[PDB]
Amino acid sequence: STINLQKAWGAARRVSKDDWLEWLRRLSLELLKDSSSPSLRSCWALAQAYNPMARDLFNAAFVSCWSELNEDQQDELIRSIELALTSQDIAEVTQTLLNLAEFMEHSDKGPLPLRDDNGIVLLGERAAKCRAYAKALHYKELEFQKGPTPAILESLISINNKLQQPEAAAGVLEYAMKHFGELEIQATWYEKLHEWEDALVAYDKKMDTNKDDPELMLGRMRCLEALGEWGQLHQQCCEKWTLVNDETQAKMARMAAAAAWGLGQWDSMEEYTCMIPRDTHDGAFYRAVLALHQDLFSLAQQCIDKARDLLDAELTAMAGESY
Amino acid sequence: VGSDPVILATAGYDHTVRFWQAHSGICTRTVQHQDSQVNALEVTPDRSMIAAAGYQHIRMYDLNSNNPNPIISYDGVNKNIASVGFHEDGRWMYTGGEDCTARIWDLRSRNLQCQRIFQVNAPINCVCLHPNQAELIVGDQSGAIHIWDLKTDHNEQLIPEPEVSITSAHIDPDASYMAAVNSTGNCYVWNLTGGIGDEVTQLIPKTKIPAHTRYALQCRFSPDSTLLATCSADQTCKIWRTSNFSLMTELSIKSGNPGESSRGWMWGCAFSGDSQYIVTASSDNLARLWCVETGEIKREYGGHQKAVVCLAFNDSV
Amino acid sequence: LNLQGINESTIPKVLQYYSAATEHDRSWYKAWHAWAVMNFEAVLHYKHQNQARDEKKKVTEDLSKTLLMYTVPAVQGFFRSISLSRGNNLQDTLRVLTLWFDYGHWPDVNEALVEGVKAIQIDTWLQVIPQLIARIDTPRPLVGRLIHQLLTDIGRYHPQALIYPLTVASKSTTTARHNAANKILKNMCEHSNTLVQQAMMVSEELIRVAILWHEMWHEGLEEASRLYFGERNVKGMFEVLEPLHAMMERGPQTLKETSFNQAYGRDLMEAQEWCRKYMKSGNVKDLTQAWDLYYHVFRRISKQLPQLTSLELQYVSPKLLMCRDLELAVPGTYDPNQPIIRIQSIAPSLQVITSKQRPRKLTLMGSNGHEFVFLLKGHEDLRQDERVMQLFGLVNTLLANDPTSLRKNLSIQRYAVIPLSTNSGLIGWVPHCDTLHALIRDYREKKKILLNIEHRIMLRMAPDYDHLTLMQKVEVFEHAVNNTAGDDLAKLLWLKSPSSEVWFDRRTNYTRSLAVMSMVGYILGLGDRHPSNLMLDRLSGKILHIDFGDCFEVAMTREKFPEKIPFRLTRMLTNAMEVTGLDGNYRITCHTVMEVLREHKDSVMAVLEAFVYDPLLNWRLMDTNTALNKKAIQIINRVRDKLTGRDFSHDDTLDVPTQVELLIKQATSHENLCQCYIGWCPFW
Amino acid sequence: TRREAIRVLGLLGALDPYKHKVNIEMLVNMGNLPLDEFYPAVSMVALMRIFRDQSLSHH
């Protein structure tokens, strides 16, 4: 009763979403047919006709089968699950497998041992990719309990910010301060936490100690822009233009244009905006602002329409997960 | 025990007081002490009898006779007894408990009630008798050191640090420096003004030594007054040279491995008669005799079922 | 006020500034409120200064004149502020009541009060109904007649808000209170005469349900045996015994009473006869027969008591079983805006909770069709809980007003409390909640972990733990904590939660509610927060506190097993929060709540003073002590130091973050934790 | 229409998310019951879910 099971496990020849969906359907139907409990097995015919019937009963059938398996087919199934999660990851199958893993965690059987440590890192990665941030936070907290690392703290802060929990991120930062000192604390932590003054201090001290670098200078510029000290930002921009590579030039261009607009230097504003790429929402926005300043109303309306077209994707992506 | 010039009494939560032998390390005999544990063991200067401080009762056991019953059981006290002192005359016994009322006991007198009472605000954690036999040092949970004069009752209240429970305080036999220690782990040292009749006894804060990071339990000076041993919850006994206040020798009982939590506290300190050796009690149920210069366990004492909390040591001839 | 402070020079200048502010803007609520508050504070300052100077003839008259001059403007301003605010006038209303009860006996002040009452709207006094009823029997007849008239008006409009407290007051042991309560009730009857009777019968039958005759005999025999055998107080023993026999003299009224009589009453009468023979003779052989009968019936009823698992209406009280579709509204449910939910029916069965006090589980049916479960508390006062609930309502309103607190959705879970007597009363039952102790026990049993593992480890390491000194207790406590994994609460929270999405929301709500309740309890001085005394919601996750018996640092003051912990923040709760610890949601929420309350220190201070200066609740202070006025003043001053932040150091004012940090360090300190009673579960 | 939707959203203004908020068991079955009882419970729950509505007219 494990031949078609193994065939479904070691297939690994799906190159499209529908192939993995059909694989999941076949796996669920085979689990229902092979289910030891007669009540679950009786639902196999209905699950063939109705997919949600198989989907809802997936966890119970998996639990029954995994209880049946004698620790070898368990290993084969675990390897197949790891292969499905890591390779050709698909959001629906990913969420189904995550729900299965959570269901196993709640059960007295115990979490499914995946590539050691019950696959905490892999489950967190999949949860983050599928935007199931609660599971990602739970798994990251478990990984932290196993052992605390600055990377774990960074991931925890990112998750909390993505979960609209600034207080949690502040607590993580406080724990980092108390335990890891100061060197392990990158200014990016404050930047994500919006502790702009602390981030500015950290950037200033790092630029004082370490030789001037594009990343630290860009971070300090971002902190200045968030704070709003347009004078210092424009001074930094003017001081470092020729000493700036083209990629760093384009990255500066947006903040430089913002500083010039704040200060009213429209000549510098035009110079910086011309450097901003056209395929950026900010680039279209600042070009429209310049058109308004120069009273190019038709070009301004066209640029605003282009900015809306660009913002379409961003709004669609963000609105998918909550308001 | 009593016949042996070296007396080392050890007791803890196991209700027994065991007298080991320094030369061998063998429990000579045990004495039953029921109804409570013991909080302090002290040998009288006369060496006639030892004194055990427990909970609500003060017991004194004979040192010469073997397997005796408690000779004197001073009752009428509550809230434990933190520590016990003894006048060099052997006439007066000084005690302090958590009832915030130090008491003075006349051993010669048959009266059960105490003689002199010094009451303070916070529970008393330690009492130390100055070598001049005229002033009494009293600690408290609020950290206010009280210098109770035995003749004028003029108590001077000094608080080295606000809202830290002071645990122990001791003065060298030469009355040069006085060390006080609190739950913070800091070692506060006071220079003693050379005033006996004047009773000035002014305390000059010399150095606040960050002796320990965790709770610090007990401090005591060497008879030579050149060494200062400091116990703590860090399981480390630190020895400070009096001239420099630097860690000459650190006596630790750590497992030397991260995979070990709560090995056991260390609250035992007793210099040898010539300060060459040092006796240390600890919660590990194993008292240890260390070498001061090298820092090695010359002898180890074992057999206590529960944690060792007190000690006794006397090399008087 | 901030710079100069309060003194003789400051008051006229601040008064003229606020008077000018009122003159330039009549309609502004803030100006009138500040003016009234300033006048009230001036009155208090003058009273305190004169008390400190004269006590420690002509000076008394001058003080009276000055106080009368400052009082009337305060009353007028408070009334105008109440009229303007229209919804958040609780502080002003309580200040009005304080001024009324303190200086209303003066004819000018009384005239100002009656003018304000005529001007003010009736609906406002619904908030301060209990405070009004606390002063029904004021010795000053001038104040009393106005109070009675106002209560007659309150009965006229929205009678439902006055029936229960009037019914409770009517059965008061003291003659004056019950007399005035009946004097109000007769006037109220001419309006309805039906609500009053329904409330009377409901109260009597509910009191009968809460305490049964056999239980009363059990407790009376316990007290009598204690007196006789420990204290040899035979006269006090007889004094304790006599009211039970007096209640027996009424005779059986229900089936349960008839059965109890047929069982024990003959033996009780024989023992009473023996007691009378002893009283007339004074023979030990006469009293020993009565004592033998008492012990025999006591053993019988002690054996019977566990069998009393459930109570049915037909035996205990068929009167309630008769009740159908009463106009009487569900207790603690009437609202001036919402439709009245009158009782539809009472469930025939009451599931008595097997506890030390044995509380019943009454469940009513409303006119709207929704069940309302209640707990029938016996032999415990509920007026303190009523004032605590009023304070919690004020705190909820303040948190709602604040933008940040409302943004974080901070609130205190509260349940309706309805006192019925000095001993019995009614408590609203909150659904989907259970004690922390029960959850811990269930999790440890499920995981096959010994329930008392930590205490057992402590005893194994040290059998004399209770008699150990402070440092020894600290060592034992640390050893126990280190050798135990204290993640039970977080683990059971994760297991109980269906999905991580719900789990995180429950944890966030738990953290925020715990922080809010901790800060509020510290300000209130609420003590004795043992795990059975606080309940965790299984759906929302909000922490709920009950059993507000000990308040205002009673736990610290009592000599036996004193508590050094302002609020329960044991390591179990700490692990239950985020893995980072207290530095996250908890500390920031505490900062927000303390900032909000310190901002509104006046309102909370007034609410607290209302029921601290209340004579009906000063018995607890006297029991705490080892006069009354100095104790109440000291308590209010301690609360003021808590709110301002000068509690830790009187000389040095403390900001909100530092005060919260010190509170956390003190509550989580092992040295302060180990002093707690073992049953408080510090290790948990 | 995407441009019009974005434009009207902008015109209406970026509403405060709290203002938006104010404007507006199977795993439990596993946690409660053992597997032998859990299987019929979840099976019955799913069969009842299918039983309602017009999907019944097919199944």
Author numbering:
A (entry chain A): 1261 to 1583
B (entry chain C): 8 to 324
C (entry chain A): 1759 to 1814, 1867 to 2436, 2492 to 2549
D (entry chain A): 880 to 903, 933 to 967
How did the manuscript describe this experimental structure?
pmcMechanistic target of rapamycin (mTOR, also known as mammalian TOR) is an essential serine/threonine protein kinase that responds to nutrients, growth factors, and cellular energy to promote cell growth. mTOR nucleates two distinct complexes, mTORC1 and mTORC2, each characterized by specific subunits, targets, downstream signaling pathways, and functions. mTORC1 contains mTOR, regulatory-associated protein of mTOR (RAPTOR), and mammalian lethal with SEC13 protein 8 (mLST8). RAPTOR binds mTORC1 substrates, including the well-characterized substrates ribosomal protein S6 kinase 1 (S6K1) and 4E binding protein 1 (4E-BP1), through a five-amino acid motif termed TOS. RAPTOR binds the LST2 TOS sequence to present LST2 to the kinase catalytic site in mTOR for phosphorylation of LST2 S670. mTORC1-dependent phosphorylation at S670 leads to monoubiquitination and stabilization of LST2.
To investigate the possibility that mTORC1 binds multiple sequences in LST2, we solved the structure of mTORC1 with bound, full-length LST2. To characterize the binding of LST2 to mTORC1, we performed cryo-EM single-particle analysis on mTORC1 in complex with full-length LST2. An overall refinement of mTORC1 in complex with LST2 was obtained at 4.02 Å resolution. Interestingly, density representing LST2 was observed only in the RAPTOR TOS-binding pocket, suggesting that mTORC1 recognizes LST2 solely through the TOS sequence. Our cryo-EM data suggest that mTORC1 recognizes LST2 exclusively through the TOS sequence and that RAPTOR binds the LST2 and 4E-BP1 TOS sequences in a highly similar manner. To determine whether LST2 is an mTORC1 substrate, as suggested by the LST2 TOS sequence, we performed an in vitro kinase assay with purified mTORC1 and full-length LST2. mTORC1 efficiently phosphorylated wild-type LST2, but not LST2-F401A, in vitro, indicating that mTORC1 phosphorylates LST2 in a TOS-dependent manner. Thus, LST2 is phosphorylated by mTORC1, primarily at S670.
